Amino acid sequence: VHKHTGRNCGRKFKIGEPLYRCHECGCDDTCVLCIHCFNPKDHVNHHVCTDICTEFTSGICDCGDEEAWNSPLHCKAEEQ
């Protein structure tokens, strides 16, 4: 359902929705992952922070956009 094989996720966050950042994996502070995409197995000993999309905040999940990540990601939605 949340699978996006061959392309980026690009899910636009809604108010109150959680999002993920990894200090090690993100190219900068703005690189984020939705809950359907964030895979714990990609960030075992990494520094991960969960945030919440506010009224004052907007944008999209970067899962599958290689420009956003220092390391290749393994999308959670791909797992069976």
Binding site: L19, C53, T57, G59, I60, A68
Partner: peptide, 4 residues
């Protein structure tokens, strides 16, 4: 990305 997230911003704004």
């Amino acid at each position: 990305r997230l911003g704004e």
